[PDB]
Amino acid sequence: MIFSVRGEVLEVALDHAVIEAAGIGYRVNATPSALATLRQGSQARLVTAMVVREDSMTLYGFSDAENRDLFLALLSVSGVGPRLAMATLAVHDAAALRQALADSDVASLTRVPGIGKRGAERIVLELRDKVAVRGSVVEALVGLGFAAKQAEEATDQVLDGELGKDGAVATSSALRAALSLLGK
Amino acid sequence: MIFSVRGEVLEVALDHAVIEAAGIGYRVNATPSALATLRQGSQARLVTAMVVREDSMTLYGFSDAENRDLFLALLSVSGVGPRLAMATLAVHDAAALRQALADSDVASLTRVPGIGKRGAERIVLELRDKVGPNAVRGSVVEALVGLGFAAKQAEEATDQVLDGELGKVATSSALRAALSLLGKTR
Amino acid sequence: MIFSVRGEVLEVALDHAVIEAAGIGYRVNATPSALATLRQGSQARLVTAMVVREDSMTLYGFSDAENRDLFLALLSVSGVGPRLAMATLAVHDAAALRQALADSDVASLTRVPGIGKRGAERIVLELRDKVGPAVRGSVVEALVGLGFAAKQAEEATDQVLDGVATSSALRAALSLLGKTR
Amino acid sequence: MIFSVRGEVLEVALDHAVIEAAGIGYRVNATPSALATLRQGSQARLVTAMVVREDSMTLYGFSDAENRDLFLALLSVSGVGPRLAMATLAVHDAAALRQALADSDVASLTRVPGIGKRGAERIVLELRDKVGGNAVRGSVVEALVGLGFAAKQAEEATDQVLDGELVATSSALRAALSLLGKTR
Amino acid sequence: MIFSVRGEVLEVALDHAVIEAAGIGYRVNATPSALATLRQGSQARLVTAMVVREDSMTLYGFSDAENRDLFLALLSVSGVGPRLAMATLAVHDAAALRQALADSDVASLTRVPGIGKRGAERIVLELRDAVRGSVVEALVGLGFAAKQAEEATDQVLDGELGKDGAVATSSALRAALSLLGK
Amino acid sequence: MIFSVRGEVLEVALDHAVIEAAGIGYRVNATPSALATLRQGSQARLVTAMVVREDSMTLYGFSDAENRDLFLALLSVSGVGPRLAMATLAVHDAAALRQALADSDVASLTRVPGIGKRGAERIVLELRDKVNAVRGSVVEALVGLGFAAKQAEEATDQVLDGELGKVATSSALRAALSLLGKTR
Amino acid sequence: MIFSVRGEVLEVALDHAVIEAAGIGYRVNATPSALATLRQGSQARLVTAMVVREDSMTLYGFSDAENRDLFLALLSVSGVGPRLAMATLAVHDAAALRQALADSDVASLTRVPGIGKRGAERIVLELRDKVGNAVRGSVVEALVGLGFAAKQAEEATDQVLDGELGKVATSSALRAALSLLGKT
Amino acid sequence: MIFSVRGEVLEVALDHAVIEAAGIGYRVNATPSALATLRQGSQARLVTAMVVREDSMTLYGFSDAENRDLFLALLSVSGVGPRLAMATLAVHDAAALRQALADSDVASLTRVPGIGKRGAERIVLELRDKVAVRGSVVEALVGLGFAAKQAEEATDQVLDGEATSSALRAALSLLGK
DNA sequence: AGTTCGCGAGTTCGC
DNA sequence: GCGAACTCGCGAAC
DNA sequence: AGTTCGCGCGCGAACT
DNA sequence: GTTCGCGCGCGAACT
Ligand SMILES: [Ca+2]
Ligand SMILES: [Ca+2]
Question: Which one of A120, A160, C88, C141 has the largest count of C-beta atoms within 10 Å of its C-beta?
């Protein structure tokens, strides 16, 4: 639910920072690259992922949304939890990790401590395949559950909703028109 | 617990927005109609429902309280979870969904992907009577029934306070008077 | 954890209010007496109890800390949950409820819908004694609260007093109690 | 997740305080030493530990991070929960508790009500070794070990980094991690 | 897991029996029709459904497999638990209940205490439910699409002299599965 | 589910027995009165209650069904678990316990170790009301199925008058249920 | 816990059988090959795996221990539950499934309905390496199974198989290796 | 609940046996010393401990009740589960383990794989010290929740008309007024 | 007509 | 496109 | 080793 | 003064 924490850095440690937002100091477990520019007394915005478990609520902090999304993708692999996903991002930068998934570079993934040959192969197996107005509307309709390329049918059908040629009429209006059509 | 998030729109995506309220950016999964209202850099108040599960805390955002309440009504139907309730509100507007429930229009509900004939019939079955479309009386009686009072005992207490020393108190004032009377009764 | 919510009242309903504190609108299920002075657009501070469950996080709001503490006392009775504790506080004011517990007035408790003779007797059984109607008494109470026996708590306080501030006396009594090294 | 609460002290009781941070009054169960510095109407920042359970979310407040970290160390001992860890910090200051752990002073720990000979021995057993010139080296090695690296591989990478360009600890950690992620 | 309990009836009550099988007396909550022929000291076989929960292990007993399967079908309806499913079978016999589901007879279901108009409508909504047909049904049960199940079963229309009607059902199923696995 | 265990008594201890039924030796925690009748090498049938929990499956054994049912009634009281219910039956016989509930004899219940004044009052409160013979039994079974007492009396009376007045309890129950299922 | 059920076959259905063992009829969900050998009225011993869940206790039956062990190996793969593991054994015989794992034959595994390319790759990834000199290998395997390091297991087994043993059963050699390993 | 399984040994492996009791073959994970005398086709009685968890029901088998009780004592130590308790009993016999606890022999316990210095110290801390008619009756009364002094006072009062079961029944009748 | 009680998944994959 | 099936990762230790 | 693995509550009411 | 034992309330019936 918490996608970022912005406020005064109260503490910077080698594995976390405390950021005070509206009087609340949030402990954010962060990668060394996210912590790099953080200094005590300075204002900072850390991009975060909140992990909720029965006996814990923990924030993980990243230098950007790309690394945060990679952390969440790592977390979706069975056998990979928050500590291992953070260790992976501490060793590999976003581009290096994204590259290792595309090239099935099990050897670089095993450089992360806690990730052995089996774990690296599971990560590659799970994340290799999981790593303009028309494309966005189709993507949003597929995201809503309109499967088997039916999103393409109702999006190309709203080719009449441009009488005075509005360029693209924005993705928000093109999606509302396709959804209106899909609901009969 | 969280019924709204107000602040700077940091991001608008096709299925969610990030709204920063007092330094915290909240990811709010929102319907396309709620997202149409949002633009990066603007201040916005998104009406929300917080869904708490053992391993998750998620905010769902709507253009108004009416759609948020309909999302919560959809969630109460067995077989309908947050993703399906959001897909339903993305396809049907508040009035159209309130209409399909009254008319038992299973065909319109089946237009929502993930909702088949069985699911549509479950939704209609569960929500037809739990949906809407002097006024003081009905509101007070409804609040007394909501507290656990039997409708007859709720009507009697409301009428005793609205017909006695009233004749045009506020609804909450009449509710406190009806509750005061119900706690004596004996 | 949340003991109060202060901010702009965004909505007032007959059973809840929405209060916006630092951009977040909190739904607070409140008693009719807590809602009485609340008006949309007005600033208000509602005294609250946060109830956490596997699939829920809910705030309950009261006109004062006394009613909030009575709600928490009602929750500690087996068979009484948040809805029943709120219904009890909607029917009985703090003084009336505290009185009914002391006098074992099962009939008044039975006026609350959802509370029958058995439930009223369980509430009276559990909360009569755990309900009400200076430096020494407070320090002894804090030591007992920490786990010290009432006998040992009284010995360390009187010893400390002969040698005011309640916190200062508590720190001195605790320093004395930890002496055996 | 919550490491501190800062705001107006609305209430000071003998076992807790209410601190209002941005309109929210947080109940913080605090040690008598943490409550000693709190006074109604004053602004205060209380250092906290949030304990999350299936049916509860509770804040515990301390006079400093040292006592808060000792509370968290006490919580990690089986048989020691929040009430017993608070009673231990109410009876023993940060220095006395760390001294009793180093000296295996079971008798001092037994002074805390609720802790008997068995409990005191469990606490000593669990926390004696888990309790607290090139300081940069030791910190970097400790952070690498914390990420999952073996101490020998952590020392080798840190030394290769501090011996080649003989500045900051976080900067040296990022250099050691960069080196450790090399497939060579 | 336990589909029947056979042994000495140690106790017969109006809502349960105790049946001793291999030295263990099993309490079996049973419908009045299942209990009807049971007598203390007599041997009996009760058809059962074992319901496992975090804090309980309970046996429910029926006069036959048809009623036991109807109890399990009732349990699959949200809002219907073991007590309500037993009350339903105590009021309605298997044929009467199966009839009420087909005819959407909400009024008859409403005769069962604990089942109101809403519950009866949920139950009706949820429960409105030779070698070739059996093999296809078993293939569909394994996850095969009905069309792919029919095609594989029909392709095994071979066998000189040995039963022109696709030999034994288990033999035809093994042949259809062998074909489906390439 | 297990209401009795019959077989060879392999062991008799002060708080339990092992009874072998068809090759399986079952440990049955039993009251001293249930153990009094058990002797190693003898065949015995112990009346039992199986208590199932997430991490345990335990058998409790009694001299008869009356004590076993009283154990189950004690278990239904909040604050009373298997150990306390066994301690109660070890101190009070079936008749004495049934008497103490009727007379609200909190002092006798307080004689059981682990049961204080509060616990004794909870037990009395919960079990005082809980712990034409054909008519009463049929009505009780109909009420047990969920029928309202008035509708249960009306159906039972319609059955016992007309084609009865002679007509077993179970037979009358099946007739009352047949009548109750008649539409309108 | 239940590894087999032996008794009278009361019922044979297309997907399960009921086998009565000492008065209890057990429903055993079985593969079509396991059901092929079952006939109503006959005595049979079905090799089983009991799957325990919070709300269920289910028996799965196989023609032999080899298929039962393969079912348990399939269950250990994330994404593969009892229904999918049974469907796999209904389509592929033992050693045919064992072959597809060794040869990474994802195409044969995808013939099982419910198993797609991703699932087949997960199964292959997880089970390829898992699913006199024979005495030595078995003893070493049992020592490794107990937690011993393979080198320490080989050293103890070799010290035992050379000296007081030259010709000395596998279990006897295991007890001798364990006796040696427990010496300080 | 299951304290023993007696029947035909269907299978003997190096870490478990299958014993058929009344038609049910029970897999019993057993120590090598418990398996030593077991042979396929032979009747055997294995002393067991049933471990119940949300997703499992497992039997552990031992050569006698002493080893089974030691397994249960090991299970009560935080950090020690069934696998580690079985590995401990596979390496150390009942007498050797009981000795190592009394003498705080952390080095012997550390010989068990999976048990390091910390684990061995936890086991020793939890299990050292923990752990005729008059003594038995007092022990049974204390086991029921009675105070050690109250148990001794009641049993000694039973020396007016005086069996360990008849003495316990007399002391329980005097303790309940 | 109230107050004990009985009851309690939602997707992303695959076909 | 809908309906079922299916559902950990760290500290301590090899 | 640097890996899959085996493993997992504390409060208070009663007695001490 | 510290081991162990013990641990849930609503929404629909239907009174
Ligand atoms: Ca509750
Ligand atoms: Ca375990």
Answer: C88
Cα A70 to Cα A76, C145, G130, distances in angstroms = 10, 47, 30
Q: What tokens appear for F165 in the block?
A: 């007045």
Pair C4, D18: CB distance under 8 Å: yes
Contact present, D and F (at least 3 Cβ pairs less than 8 Å): no
Tokens of E57: 């292990």
Tell me if B25 and A7 make a contact (CB, 8 A cut-off): no
What does the block give as tokens for C15? 């059973």
Nucleotide nearest to A111 (CA to C1'): K2
What kind and span of H or E run contains D27?
strand D24-30
Q: Is G152 in a helix, a strand, or coil?
A: helix
Strands G56-62, G24-30: pairing kind: parallel
- The CA distance from H78 to the nearest CA of chain D, in Å, is 7
**Closest protein residue to L9 using CA and C1' atoms?**
C81
C1' of L9 to CA of C82 (Å): 8
To the nearest 10°, report the CA torsion of C79, C80, C82, C84: 110
Residue numbers after which chain E breaks, C to N beyond 2.5 angstroms = 129
Return the structure tokens found at H49.
């401990």
Partner residues linked to A44 by β-bridges: A7
Chain F nearest-CA distance from E60, in A, is 10
* Alpha carbon of A78: minimum distance to chain G alpha carbons (Å): 7
Measure the CA–CA gap between H113 and H99, rounded to whole angstroms: 19
A43-53 and A56-62 beta bridge pairing: antiparallel
Contact A171 B14 (CB under 8 A): yes
Q: If DSSP codes are grouped into helix, strand and coil, which group holds residue H25?
A: strand
Q: How many cross-chain Cβ pairs, A to G, lie less than 8 Å apart?
A: 11
CA distances from D59 to B59, D62, D173 (A): 24, 10, 33
Alpha carbon distances (Å) from C47 to C28, C71, E5, F180: 10, 11, 58, 52
Question: Distance between CA C42 and CA C57 in Å, rounded?
Answer: 25
D56 contacts C181? CB cut-off 8 A: no
Asked whether the beta carbons of F126 and F140 are under 8 A apart, the reply is no
List all nucleotides in chain L with at least one atom under 7 A from a protein Cβ: 1-15
Nucleotide closest in space to B119 (CA vs C1')? J2
Rounded to an integer, what distance in angstroms lies between the CA atom of residue B167 and that of residue B174? Answer: 11
Hey, how many other C-beta atoms are within 10 angstroms of the C-beta on B168? 6
Token readout for F32 is 């001293």
Cβ atoms of F5 and F48 within 8 Å: the answer is yes
What is the number of other CB atoms lying within 10 angstroms of the CB of residue F54?
10
Amino acid at H4: S
Question: What is the rounded CA–CA span in Å between residue G142 and residue E77?
Answer: 48
DSSP string, B135-178: HHHHHHHHHHHHTT--HHHHHHHHHHHHTTTT----HHHHHHHH
| H86 alpha carbon, closest ligand | 2
Residues forming beta bridges with residue E59, ordered by sequence position: E28, E50
On the CB side of B157, how many CA atoms lie within 13 Å of its CA? Answer: 27
Q: How many angstroms is it from C51 CA to the middle of ligand 1?
A: 9
- B76 CB contacts (<8 Å, ≥6 apart)? B126, B130
Q: List beta partners, residue A8.
A: A20, A43
Nearest to H90 among G3, G52, G178 (CB): G178
Does H108 contact chain G (CB < 8 Å)? yes
List all residues of chain F from 47 to 86 with a beta carbon under 8 Å from chain C.
Answer: 78-79
d(Cα A159, Cα A153) in Å, to the nearest integer? 11
Ligand nearest to the CA of D54: 1
* Interface contact H2, partner F, CB < 8 A: yes
Dihedral angle over CA of G13, G14, G20, G26, nearest 10: -110
